[PDB]
């Protein structure tokens, strides 16, 4: 360590920062302001660095004083304790489901009905069934032979002036 | 694309690199298909009193997109108070000159 | 947007003199060009105009038959041929660009008709 | 078309209002009337066209009015740089100029 | 050369639906008897397009945006529309693109132009060459910073017996143009049907475009007064403007290789089904085509409401440092730190991070941070990394292979060197 | 653009802006000769099991 030393032989001050993600209350955070919490709505949440998308609701899950996060069978987060107010909030993934189109052949009509699978007629001539929310098909009291199967005993067909009926 | 940088900044001309040059001066995409060529131009681009004609962007609000060029000379507002084109406290000139 | 006149000087009465106007900085071939003169201490007097394409020309009544105006759009020049000059033609002759009126004026060439 | 300007000489001081007149021997077509300024040793400069349209760069103390055979140039608050000779011009039937009005300092 | 044109006839802007128009060959590939699905900037079907008239004195030529693209169609009989203008501010301070059509030729320039309000091409008679010339200096006053020029055959060629549709795009560095000429007899509005636009050019101008304007011609034959906002008459020529959007289309191909039909997958669920089944015919039944998912509306950021700064100053700007064999360790906890300022500081000659980047470090919380500090020489700096060997990494300071952090070093010859 | 195959004459009318053709598998079906603007079909060389 002489001034006339080559650069490879000159002194260098080294600082090694190591970060550990112990599953614990993360105290060292980077300079970021928190926001207000919105319940019963689909939001992209960030709790102490843990991120995800879901609906935050009130819960009756009695977390122990040392417990901060809950997990489901899949090891995904089930519930969290709000870092500002020590309450337990359930995380319910935002409503989703398959979309099926119920239609007679294009050789007859270009009118179609849309079935939203395993959802309620909320988030979306609307008929709620146990197969999902069926929109565009008229609910008819008269029974007929099954033509286009939907599920749970409900079938659809193109009849009368003509329209799709359920 | 042709330009002049210093020795220790040559390594920043590569896909997925970070630094003052790759963020604020010349950014390469991650799917870049081509070659990067450089050579020491100390005999041509150096002056006995210092060659101050080659500049680089030192301050910028965000990083450049790949193959984007920023030649603005607006005063960099580092703080919360607007600068109104006046250099000074928390109001830097965004371009610096090489020695 | 600049007009520089040339060809001024002294000319004996009865003789001829040709003035020239070199243009630069604008689409010369799209503007009509005028000549205007001003005798010492007197008012402005329009002399001649030439259309942008050189097809139409007009002259002041006091110079009809004696003056001829021309232009060369390839060389961005306008010329004024002044024949059979009289002592009363002594004046500063301005080159000016049509906008109609004239919105760009040259500094002028001094023409003195004297023996 | 003969243009007769009046008065021949106007003597005023900065800050005052100047009124310059121009009369044509025949009615001017299409309000094709222009005003020009000339300082000693300088080329003329366009002030007003279309009888009332201010040229680019001309300050708003200059305004033009009139129609037919009778036109007026008004300078609302004279400045030292405004003392000069003023010419009117019609460009509807050939191109003729007035004899000029001199605006001098009283 | 810069005369204004301010005839005052106000009429509200009209709107129309583009039933099936604006389809263009996305690539220069030949396909026949095949259905092909591609995502690209297209004009959605039954789209709400504006309508502008030029009939008498009503003229409509405002400056319109160029957000992502344009579908420009024109019903004409006298070739009144001569070209367009593209740019951001359309003044001498910035570069701008120009496209104009002379008889049997086209002129394209990228200069810094100074357009006057309400530009247009002027037509007159010249009395020499014996031919009505078409001087273009009414559009622009001056042309500075010219970099590109190009000439080619007419883009526009011959109530409304012909229809000319154009598609403009401003992809990364190329200005791409697709065009089609279709004859029709309809006189009111767009003719419902189908017709594809073939590409024409792709100019590598490489500029930024946000606004655009159209260029038309005026008729002053029956009489000519002095240049002013009068003495002009415009024949019946109207144009419609539509903005393109990234859309996934399913394209049909005939024997010849022409498109002749297409489908916009997001128009309706029936189109979703058609795209899913890769066919323009859907058999009777139920098909699963997509998935409904509720999206989040806002983000929720929650952290403990504590207020303290991590003491990085006494770690980095420490007066004296430790030997590498007895390297000091500082444990950082219960504080808030800005790694962005640390990375910003150019005092450091080495700043390598592993398993995480510093730019994405000032938004992640950790339970504890350990700051190990020591002094080594230049050629030993490279040994402070996962999976390195040497006297330092083996006997002095060893990093794990699963290390998550950053290694920072700087030359301390001015501080840690003695003359002896 | 490289490959192996038999180059034959074709009756496929490529448009003036089209230079290459493709098959269902996205492989090249035909090319326009860069020197003489004619369309040639590309037929993979005869193969089969033994
Ligand atoms: C092209 O120009 C436009 C406007 O001239 C740019 O839009 C601006 O982008 C900056 C980005 O920091 C914003 O702060 C401004 O507010 C935008 N302008 C407006 C009016 O909103 C656009 O970014 C330019 N394109 C490129 C690639 O630089
Ligand atoms: C529609 O069905 C009928 C018989 O039901 C058939 O004759 C006809 O060809 C079909 N349409 C098409 C386009 O094939
Ligand atoms: C839909 O929500 C209502 C509450 O408004 C409930 O009564 C109904 O049973 C729900 N149906 C389904 C299918 O979830
Ligand atoms: C079916 O019949 C019941 C009673 O007969 C009636 O309340 C109901 O509205 C009917 N449904 C429809 C779809 O007509
Ligand atoms: C188009 O816009 C107008 C208003 O500008 C609106 O009334 C009309 O419903 C719109 N049509 C469509 C198809 O969006
Ligand atoms: C564009 O013109 C300006 C003159 O105002 C000049 O300084 C600049 O260098 C020109 N651009 C280029 C690329 O030469
Ligand atoms: C295109 O189709 C027409 C009939 O639909 C046919 O006559 C013509 O030959 C086809 N073109 C080619 C190149 O085969």
Q: Is E12 helix (H, G, I), strand (E, B) or coil?
A: coil
CA dihedral B48, B54, B59, B63 (to 10 degrees): -140
Asked if B46 contacts B55 with a C-beta cutoff of 8 angstroms, the reply is no
C-alpha dihedral sign at E118, E119, E123, E128: positive
DSSP 8-state code for residue B8:
G
Whole-angstrom Cα distance, residue E340 to residue B63? 13
The distance of Cα B51 from the centroid of its chain, to the nearest Å, equals: 16
The residue with tokens 């038959």 is C65
The helix, strand and coil proportions of chain F, stated in percent and rounded to the nearest 5, come to: 0, 35, 65
Round to the nearest angstrom and report the end-to-end CA distance of chain D. 33
Residue E394 neighbours by CB under 8 Å, 6+ apart: none
Around Cβ E167, how many Cβ atoms within 10 Å?
27
Mutate to test the interface with F, among E24, E29, E33 (most CBs of F within 10 A): E29
Asked if E265 contacts E277 with a C-beta cutoff of 8 angstroms, the reply is no
What is the enclosing helix (H) or strand (E) of D86? Answer: strand D85-90
Q: Does E256 touch chain F (CB under 8 A)?
A: yes
The distance of Cα D105 from the centroid of its chain, to the nearest Å, equals: 17
**Technique used:** cryo-EM
Scored b (16 or more CB within 10 A) or e, E360-375 reads ebbbbbbbbbebbbbb
Asked if E52 contacts E87 with a C-beta cutoff of 8 angstroms, the reply is no
Chain D touching partners, 3 or more CB pairs below 8 A = C, E
What is the enclosing helix (H) or strand (E) of B22? Answer: helix B20-24
Q: Measuring CA to CA, how many Å separate E338 from each of A35, B89, E314?
A: 19, 21, 15
Q: Residue whose CA is closest, atom 4 of ligand 5?
A: E15
Q: Which chain E residues touch D56 with a CB distance below 8 Å? A: none
- Two tokens, residue E283: 């058999």
Strand order across the E162-170 sheet: E14-18, E47-52, E238-243, E69-76, E162-170, E175-183, E198-203
Residue B34 neighbours by CB under 8 Å, 6+ apart: none
Whole-angstrom Cα distance, residue E184 to residue E151? 29
CA dihedral A66, A70, A75, A77 (to 10 degrees): -130
Closest to E231 measured CA to CA, from E3, E13, E79, E62: E3
Q: Which chain B residues touch E358 with a CB distance below 8 Å? A: 18
The Cα diameter of chain E in Å comes to: 101
**Do B and C have ≥3 inter-chain CB pairs under 8 A?**
no
The residue with tokens 């069934």 is A129
Scored b (16 or more CB within 10 A) or e, E6-25 reads eeeeeeeeeeeebebbbbbb
Closest to E85 measured CA to CA, from E202, E185, E213, E171: E213
Interface touch E370/A17, C-beta < 8 Å: yes
Residue D86 neighbours by CB under 8 Å, 6+ apart: D5, D20, D35, D36, D37, D38, D47, D73, D100, D101, D103
Whole-angstrom Cα distance, residue E89 to residue E93? 8
Q: Does C10 touch chain D (CB under 8 A)?
A: no
Q: Measuring CA to CA, how many Å separate E368 from each of A82, E330, E332, E333, E362?
A: 20, 10, 6, 5, 15
Around Cβ C11, how many Cβ atoms within 10 Å?
18
Which residue in A26, A44, A95 is closest to E367 by CB distance? Answer: A26
Q: Residue whose CA is closest, atom 10 of ligand 4?
A: A141
Q: Residue whose CA is closest, atom 5 of ligand 5?
A: E15
Asked if D47 contacts D56 with a C-beta cutoff of 8 angstroms, the reply is no
Whole-angstrom Cα distance, residue E282 to residue A100? 14
Asked if E365 contacts A13 with a C-beta cutoff of 8 angstroms, the reply is no
The residue with tokens 């003052």 is B20
Whole-angstrom Cα distance, residue C55 to residue E317? 84
Whole-angstrom Cα distance, residue A57 to residue A80? 10
Interface touch E403/A108, C-beta < 8 Å: no
Whole-angstrom Cα distance, residue C33 to residue C69? 9
- Two tokens, residue E333: 């906890």
Interface touch C44/D46, C-beta < 8 Å: no
Strand order across the A126-129 sheet: A126-129, A132-135, A113-117, A96-103, E285-293
Closest to A81 measured CA to CA, from A116, A110, A56: A56
Whole-angstrom Cα distance, residue E265 to residue E278? 11
At residue B44, what are phi and psi to the nearest 5 degrees?
-105, -40
Asked if A57 contacts A22 with a C-beta cutoff of 8 angstroms, the reply is no
Topology at the third CATH level for domain E15-293: Jelly Rolls (2.60.120)
Beta-bridge mates of residue C44: C38
Whole-angstrom Cα distance, residue E195 to residue E166? 12
Task: Decide whether any atom of ligand 7 lies within 6 Å of the F13 Cβ.
Answer: yes
Whole-angstrom Cα distance, residue E376 to residue E374? 7
Closest to C112 measured CA to CA, from C19, C2, C3: C19
Enumerate residues preceding breaks in chain A (C to N > 2.5 Å).
Answer: 124, 160
Closest to C17 measured CA to CA, from C45, C43, C40, C37: C37
Asked if C5 contacts C93 with a C-beta cutoff of 8 angstroms, the reply is yes
- Two tokens, residue E171: 């992809």
Closest to A78 measured CA to CA, from A69, A68, A87: A69
Closest to A24 measured CA to CA, from E333, E337, E399: E333
Q: Is C29 helix (H, G, I), strand (E, B) or coil?
A: helix
Does residue E197 come out as left (phi exceeding 0), alpha (psi in the -120 to 50 range) or beta? Answer: beta
DSSP 8-state code for residue D29:
G
Asked if A50 contacts E300 with a C-beta cutoff of 8 angstroms, the reply is no
Q: Is E330 helix (H, G, I), strand (E, B) or coil?
A: strand
Asked if D18 contacts D74 with a C-beta cutoff of 8 angstroms, the reply is yes
The Cα diameter of chain B in Å comes to: 44
Q: Is E344 helix (H, G, I), strand (E, B) or coil?
A: helix
Residue of C nearest to E140 (CA): C27
Tell me the count of A-E CB pairs closer than 8 A: 293
Residue E357 neighbours by CB under 8 Å, 6+ apart: B18
Cβ burial, residue E269 (10 Å; 0-12/13-18/19+): buried
Strands E162-170 and E69-76: antiparallel
Cα angle A132, A138, A142; round to 5: 105
Residue of F nearest to E36 (CA): F24
Cα angle E101, E103, E109; round to 5: 30
Whole-angstrom Cα distance, residue E275 to residue E37? 7
Beta-bridge mates of residue C3: C23
Candidates E48, E240, E245: which one to mutate for ligand 5, based on the most atoms within 8 Å of Cβ? E48
Whole-angstrom Cα distance, residue B95 to residue E323? 39
- Two tokens, residue E203: 């100019």
Whole-angstrom Cα distance, residue C5 to residue C108? 6
C-alpha dihedral sign at E207, E211, E212, E213: negative
The residue with tokens 């450091």 is E348
Residue A16 neighbours by CB under 8 Å, 6+ apart: E371, E372, E373, E384, E397, E399, E405, E406, E407, E408
DSSP 8-state code for residue A66:
T
The distance of Cα A130 from the centroid of its chain, to the nearest Å, equals: 21
Q: Is F5 helix (H, G, I), strand (E, B) or coil?
A: coil
Cα angle E30, E31, E35; round to 5: 150
Closest to D72 measured CA to CA, from D62, D82, D84: D62
Q: Does E152 touch chain B (CB under 8 A)?
A: no
Chain A touching partners, 3 or more CB pairs below 8 A = E
Around Cβ E110, how many Cβ atoms within 10 Å?
23
Whole-angstrom Cα distance, residue E324 to residue E169? 60
Closest to D30 measured CA to CA, from D46, D50, D55: D50
Q: Measuring CA to CA, how many Å separate E71 from each of B61, C43, E154, E215, E219?
A: 35, 60, 19, 16, 27
Whole-angstrom Cα distance, residue E406 to residue E354? 6
Closest to E27 measured CA to CA, from B81, A139, F20: F20
Residue of F nearest to E199 (CA): F17
Interface list for chain D against chain C, based on CB atoms closer than 8 Å? 32, 34, 36, 38, 43-46, 49, 55, 85, 87, 89, 91, 94-100
The distance of Cα E201 from the centroid of its chain, to the nearest Å, equals: 18
Residue E70 neighbours by CB under 8 Å, 6+ apart: E166, E167, E168, E212, E241, E242, E243, E244
The helix, strand and coil proportions of chain C, stated in percent and rounded to the nearest 5, come to: 5, 55, 40
- Two tokens, residue E353: 């991070």
Whole-angstrom Cα distance, residue C26 to residue E175? 30
Closest to E277 measured CA to CA, from E35, E38, E31: E35
Asked if A102 contacts A156 with a C-beta cutoff of 8 angstroms, the reply is yes
The residue with tokens 């962005």 is E340
DSSP 8-state code for residue A28:
B
- Two tokens, residue E69: 């693209």
Around Cβ A159, how many Cβ atoms within 10 Å?
15
Whole-angstrom Cα distance, residue C112 to residue D20? 33
CA distance E24 to chain F (A): 13
Residue D83 neighbours by CB under 8 Å, 6+ apart: D103, D104, D105
Task: Decide whether any atom of ligand 5 lies within 6 Å of the E17 Cβ.
Answer: yes
The residue with tokens 């006339």 is A4
DSSP string, A81-107: E-SSS--EEEEEPPPEEEEEEEE--TT
- Two tokens, residue B19: 């630094």
């Amino acid at each position: 360590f002489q001034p006339t030393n080559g650069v490879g032989y000159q002194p260098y001050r080294v600082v090694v920062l190591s970060f550990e993600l112990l599953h614990a209350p993360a105290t060292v955070c980077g300079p970021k302001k928190s926001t207000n919490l919105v319940k019963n709505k689909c939001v992209n949440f960030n709790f102490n660095g843990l991120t995800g998308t879901g609906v935050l609701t009130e819960s009756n899950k009695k977390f122990l004083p040392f417990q901060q996060f809950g997990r489901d069978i899949a090891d995904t987060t089930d519930a969290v304790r709000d870092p500002q107010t020590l309450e337990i909030l359930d995380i319910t993934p935002c409503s989703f489901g398959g979309v099926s189109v119920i239609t007679p052949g294009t050789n007859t009509s270009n009118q179609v009905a849309v079935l939203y699978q395993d959802v309620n007629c909320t988030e979306v001539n609307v008929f709620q069934t146990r197969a999902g929310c069926l929109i565009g098909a008229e609910h008819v009291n008269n029974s007929y032979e099954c033509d286009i199967p939907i599920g749970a005993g409900i079938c659809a067909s193109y009849q009368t002036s003509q329209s799709i009926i359920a | 694309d042709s330009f002049v940088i210093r020795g220790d900044e040559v390594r920043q001309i590569a896909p997925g690199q970070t630094g003052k040059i790759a963020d604020y001066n010349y950014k390469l995409p991650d799917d870049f298909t081509g070659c990067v060529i450089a050579w020491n131009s100390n005999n041509l681009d150096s002056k006995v009193g210092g060659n101050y004609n080659y500049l680089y962007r030192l301050f910028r609000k965000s990083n450049l997109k790949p193959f984007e060029r920023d030649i603005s000379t607006e005063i960099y507002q580092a703080g919360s108070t607007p600068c109104n084109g006046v250099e000074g406290f928390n109001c830097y000139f965004p371009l610096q000159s090489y020695g | 947007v600049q007009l520089v006149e040339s060809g001024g000087g002294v000319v004996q009465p009865g003789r001829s003199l040709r003035l020239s106007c070199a243009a630069s900085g604008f689409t010369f071939s799209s503007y009509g060009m005028h000549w205007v003169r001003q005798a010492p201490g007197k008012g402005l007097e329009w002399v001649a105009l030439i259309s942008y394409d050189g097809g139409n020309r007009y002259y002041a009544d006091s110079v009809k038959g004696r003056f001829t105006i021309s232009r060369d759009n390839s060389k961005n020049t306008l010329y004024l041929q002044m024949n059979r000059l009289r002592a009363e033609d002594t004046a500063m002759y301005y080159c000016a660009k049509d906008r109609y009126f004239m919105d760009v004026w040259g500094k002028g060439t001094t023409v003195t008709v004297s023996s | 078309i003969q243009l007769t300007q009046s008065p021949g000489t106007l003597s005023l001081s900065p800050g005052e209002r100047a009124t310059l007149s121009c009369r044509a021997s025949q009615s001017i077509s299409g309000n094709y009337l222009a005003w020009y300024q000339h300082k000693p040793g300088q080329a003329p400069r366009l002030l007003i066209y279309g009888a009332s349209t201010r040229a680019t760069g001309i300050p708003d103390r200059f305004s033009g009015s009139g129609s037919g055979t009778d036109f007026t140039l008004t300078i609302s608050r004279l400045e030292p740089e405004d003392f000069a000779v003023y010419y009117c011009q019609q460009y509807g039937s050939s191109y003729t100029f007035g004899q000029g009005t001199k605006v001098e300092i009283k | 050369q810069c005369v204004n044109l301010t005839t005052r006839t106000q009429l509200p802007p009209a709107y129309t639906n583009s039933f099936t128009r604006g389809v263009y060959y996305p690539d220069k590939v030949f396909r026949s008897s095949v259905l092909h699905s591609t995502q690209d900037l297209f004009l959605p079907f039954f789209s709400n397009v504006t309508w502008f008239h030029a009939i008498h004195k009503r003229f409509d030529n405002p400056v319109l945006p160029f957000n992502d693209g344009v579908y420009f169609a024109s019903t004409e009989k006298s070739n009144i529309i001569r070209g367009w203008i593209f740019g951001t501010t359309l003044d001498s301070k910035t570069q701008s693109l120009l496209i104009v059509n002379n008889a049997t030729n086209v002129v394209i320039k990228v200069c810094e132009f100074q357009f006057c309000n309400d530009p247009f091409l002027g037509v007159y008679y010249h009395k020499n060459n014996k031919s009505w010339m078409e001087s273009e200096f009414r559009v622009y006053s001056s042309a500075n910073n010219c970099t590109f020029e190009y000439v080619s055959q007419p883009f526009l060629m011959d109530n409304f017996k012909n229809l000319r549709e154009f598609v403009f795009k401003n992809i990364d560095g190329y200005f791409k143009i697709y065009s089609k000429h279709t004859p029709i007899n309809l006189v009111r509005d767009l003719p419902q049907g189908f017709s594809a636009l073939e590409p024409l050019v792709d100019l590598p101008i490489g500029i930024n475009i946000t606004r655009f304007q159209t260029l038309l011609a005026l008729h002053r034959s029956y009489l000519t007064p002095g240049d002013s906002s009068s003495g002009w008459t415009a024949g019946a020529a109207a144009y419609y403007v539509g903005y393109l959007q990234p859309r996934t289309f399913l394209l049909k191909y005939n024997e010849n290789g022409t498109i002749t039909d297409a489908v916009d997958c997001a128009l309706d669920p029936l189109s979703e089904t058609k795209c899913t089944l890769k066919s323009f015919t859907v058999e009777k039944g139920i098909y699963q085509t997509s998935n409904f998912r509720v999206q989040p509306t806002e983000s929720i950021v929650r952290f403990p409401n504590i207020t303290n700064l991590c003491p990085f100053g006494e770690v980095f700007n420490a007066t004296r440092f430790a030997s590498v064999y007895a390297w000091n360790r500082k444990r950082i906890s219960n504080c808030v730190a800005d790694y962005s300022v640390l990375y910003n500081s150019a005092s450091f000659s080495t700043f390598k991070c592993y398993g995480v980047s510093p730019t994405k470090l000032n938004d992640l919380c950790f339970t504890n941070v350990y700051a190990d500090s020591f002094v080594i020489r230049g050629d030993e700096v490279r040994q402070i990394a996962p999976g390195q060997t040497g006297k330092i990494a083996d006997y002095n300071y060893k990093l794990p292979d699963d290390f998550t952090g950053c290694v920072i070093a700087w030359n301390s010859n001015n501080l840690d060197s003695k003359v002896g």
